[PDB]
């Protein structure tokens, strides 16, 4: 059908894109992953990766949905059909990140759910859930002595089991929030995206106004200058491995979400000639400025507890996504009537997340329907398919909040929608807009709608460095290959690493496997056949 | 260094046909866009047409949309403009700009040349 | 087509005063899409001022722009020999492009 929506007005598109950047994959999974690789490390390739590939990636994905309005998949039917297969791959992405995404917002949920209480579980280790190793952080200075903050986490959040092997029951508590999340989301979600007016002027400055007060609160503790210095001192030695390499690279990949079809699609509602340079390059800023900053809260954090406790920086905390829940209570407690504060943050944690969720929601249904715009046409028909794939997505999210779920999480975190398929894609994206379709070609167009060239940044960006950048991390992680470990001292059996080969395989495929299929459906002889392809279509 | 040098034009019966030319050297012409801007005799400036870097992307103002046609010759930095049909009101000095940002205007002009028609 | 207007037919000046020329368009026009343009008599314009307020890179320093929405203005610190000129500002957001009627200043 003709129709086709557009932006009221470019404040919608600004506050969609900034719910979309800003969510957990800042304050939550940059530290643990700066943390896992020693600290300041991690930062030479994290921002080689930012200058060279990143901010370019974002503006080809917002320009490229603006010029072609069409979602993920629909676009590169008029940019090279050949290579078609890369929205297939940029959707499964997104089916699979929506699965494992939510856990995190199950877990502040029951968090929240326990902190309306007349005391902190977390401060004392008087219950029942404890091992007689527990001793409060002011006498464990004074052999296996344990902190509470751990104990709560691992002996009543997780309920951990011993291992992969061994799922144990399902916890219907953590069961009950996985479901009123996916309420909540299909409650805003079945009508339509909208800004909703003043609701926003709320939403949009009280989680950084808290992320505000936890920094001050952080800095200002016993041993933060310890955690600094832990924290913005390479160690050399560590480049020589690939991990912290790719480590640092895919997170740039993952906290931008541009190798999904979610940015895609919400520019394809901008009018054709608006101008959005500046405001991608400062929502990169802003990204980039939050998730660095989130590192002072944090490592300060780590260093007051190294100090109190008597331990080396390395050896405080858990080396894995625990690590946001272990830090932040503990910097909770340090305040008057922990009981307010520990109400907000979670509050807090749950505006970040559920912005980002509704919007690549959106922006999978968007992806989705533009397939089958008659179809699934506006009626009953989008209440149906919402439905059906949330109610997936909620039955597959369930497999990992049983007492052996944080072994799946960190699987699919290491595996799913958060690895070596995001180079795969990246690099197929620019190697197709620079090489095929022509860097002239695109820079024209882009010319036409903005008024001025993209110039040197973004030509080379896409011509040179991200492929190369690509295909480097792609082959040193695999000459200098090492496998898969949970918390620095569990080894993965190899029927989960062979799942996780599986599970990224399943997103890789897509690229090379729709070439075949559409090459093989077209008549003639193949040098005809591959030149009715490489030339837009629709 | 930039050189801009428009060629052609003289009487025309009305009704005729006439194709203009603009020759171009010291600068990338493959690259910037260019447009053709015309003076009437009552000194007023009108806009007449443009044509993108490759020639994809072409615009016409409204009163010559169906009468003038814009060109390229990358091959030899010439560009030109062919006429249909020349009214009466055709008559007028043609510019030659070199307008490719548009957040910038046009920072270079041609010499122009004369129309005419009985 | 959005026609834009400019107030002073022509202007006569003695080397001693400062002056401001006022475009006015028919629909409101972005900032970074109205330039200023300087013909001398007998010879081919010349880019002035763009972007509503940047300077080109000859013109004096004296001459400044300011203004936004549906109406701009160019103004002259210093009026002096040697700047008579017509003057035209110029629409660059959206097509057709629309140059104003334009203002002469002598004396």
């Known amino acids: 059908p003709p129709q086709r929506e557009k932006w009221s007005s470019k404040i919608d598109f600004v506050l969609s894109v900034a719910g979309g950047f800003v969510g957990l994959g800042n304050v939550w999974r940059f530290p643990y992953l700066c943390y896992k690789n020693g600290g300041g490390a991690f930062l030479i390739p994290y921002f080689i990766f930012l200058f060279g590939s990143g901010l370019p990636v974002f503006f080809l994905e917002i320009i490229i949905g603006q010029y072609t309005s069409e979602g993920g998949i629909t676009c590169w039917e008029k940019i090279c059909p050949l290579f078609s297969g890369i929205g297939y791959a940029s959707v499964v992405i997104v089916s699979l990140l929506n699965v494992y995404y939510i856990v995190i917002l199950a877990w502040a949920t029951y968090y929240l759910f326990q902190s309306f209480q007349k005391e902190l579980p977390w401060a004392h280790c008087n219950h029942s859930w404890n091992t007689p190793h527990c001793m409060e952080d002011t006498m464990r200075k004074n052999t296996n002595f344990t902190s509470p903050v751990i104990e709560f986490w691992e002996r009543n959040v997780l309920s951990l089991s011993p291992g992969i092997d061994h799922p144990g029951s399902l916890k219907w508590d953590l069961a009950l929030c996985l479901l009123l999340v996916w309420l909540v989301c299909f409650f805003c979600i079945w009508k339509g995206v909208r800004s909703t007016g003043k609701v926003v002027y709320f939403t949009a400055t009280f989680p950084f106004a808290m992320l505000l007060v936890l920094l001050v609160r952080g800095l200002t503790l016993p041993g933060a200058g310890a955690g600094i210095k832990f924290y913005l001192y390479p160690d050399i030695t560590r480049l020589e491995d690939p991990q912290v390499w790719i480590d640092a690279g895919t997170q740039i990949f993952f906290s931008y979400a541009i190798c999904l079809g979610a940015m895609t699609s919400l520019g394809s509602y901008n009018k054709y000639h608006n101008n959005v340079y500046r405001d991608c390059m400062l929502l990169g800023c802003l990204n980039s400025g939050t998730s660095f900053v989130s590192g002072f809260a944090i490592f300060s954090i780590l260093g007051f507890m190294a100090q109190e406790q008597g331990v080396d920086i390395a050896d405080v905390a858990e080396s894995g996504p625990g690590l946001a829940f272990i830090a932040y209570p503990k910097a909770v407690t340090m305040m008057p009537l922990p009981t307010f504060w520990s109400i907000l943050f979670f509050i807090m944690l749950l505006l970040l997340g559920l912005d980002s969720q509704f919007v690549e929601v959106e922006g999978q249904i968007t992806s989705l329907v533009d397939l089958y715009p008659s179809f699934l046409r506006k009626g009953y028909r989008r209440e149906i398919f919402i439905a059906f794939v949330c109610s997936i997505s909620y039955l597959l999210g369930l497999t990992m909040v049983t007492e052996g779920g944080m072994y799946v999480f960190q699987l699919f975190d290491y595996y799913a929608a958060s690895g070596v398929c995001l180079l795969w894609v990246a690099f197929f994206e620019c190697f197709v807009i620079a090489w095929i379709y022509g860097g002239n070609r695109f820079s024209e167009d882009i010319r036409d709608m903005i008024g001025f060239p993209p110039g040197p940044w973004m030509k080379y960006s896409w011509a040179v460095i991200t492929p190369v950048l690509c295909v480097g991390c792609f082959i040193f992680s695999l000459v200098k290959y090492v496998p898969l470990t949970y918390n620095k001292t569990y080894v993965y059996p190899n029927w989960a690493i062979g799942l996780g080969w599986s599970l990224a395989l399943s997103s890789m495929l897509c690229v090379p496997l729709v070439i075949v299929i559409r090459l093989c459906q077209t008549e003639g002889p193949f040098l005809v056949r591959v030149k009715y392809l490489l030339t837009p279509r629709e | 260094e930039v050189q801009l040098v428009e060629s052609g034009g003289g009487l025309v019966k009305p009704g005729g046909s006439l194709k203009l030319s603009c020759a171009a050297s010291?600068?990338?012409?493959?690259?910037?866009?260019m447009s053709w801007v015309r003076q009437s005799p009552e000194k007023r400036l009108e806009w007449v047409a443009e044509i993108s870097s490759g020639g994809r992307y072409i615009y016409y103002s409204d009163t010559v949309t169906g009468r003038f046609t814009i060109s390229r010759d990358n091959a030899r930095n010439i560009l030109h403009l062919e006429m249909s049909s020349l009214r009466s009101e055709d008559t007028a000095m043609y510019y030659c700009?070199?307008?490719?940002?548009?957040?910038?205007?046009?920072?270079?002009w041609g010499q122009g040349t004369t129309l005419t028609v009985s | 087509e959005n026609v834009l207007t400019q107030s002073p037919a022509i202007m006569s000046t003695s080397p001693g005063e400062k002056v401001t020329m006022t475009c006015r368009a028919s629909?409101?026009?972005?900032?970074?899409?109205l330039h200023w343009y300087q013909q001398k008599s007998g010879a081919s314009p010349k880019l002035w001022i763009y972007?509503?307020?940047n300077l080109a890179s000859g013109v004096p320093a004296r001459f400044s722009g300011s203004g936004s929405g549906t109406s701009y203005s160019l103004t002259i610190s210093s009026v002096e020999a040697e700047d008579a000129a017509t003057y035209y500002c110029?629409?660059?957001?959206?097509?057709?492009?629309?140059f104003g009627s334009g203002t002469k200043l002598e004396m």
């Open positions: 700009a070199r307008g490719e940002v548009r957040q910038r205007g046009f920072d270079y």
């Open positions: 010291g600068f990338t012409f493959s690259s910037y866009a």
């Open positions: 629909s409101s026009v972005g900032s970074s899409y």
């Open positions: 110029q629409q660059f957001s959206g097509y057709p492009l629309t």
């Open positions: 972007s509503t307020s």
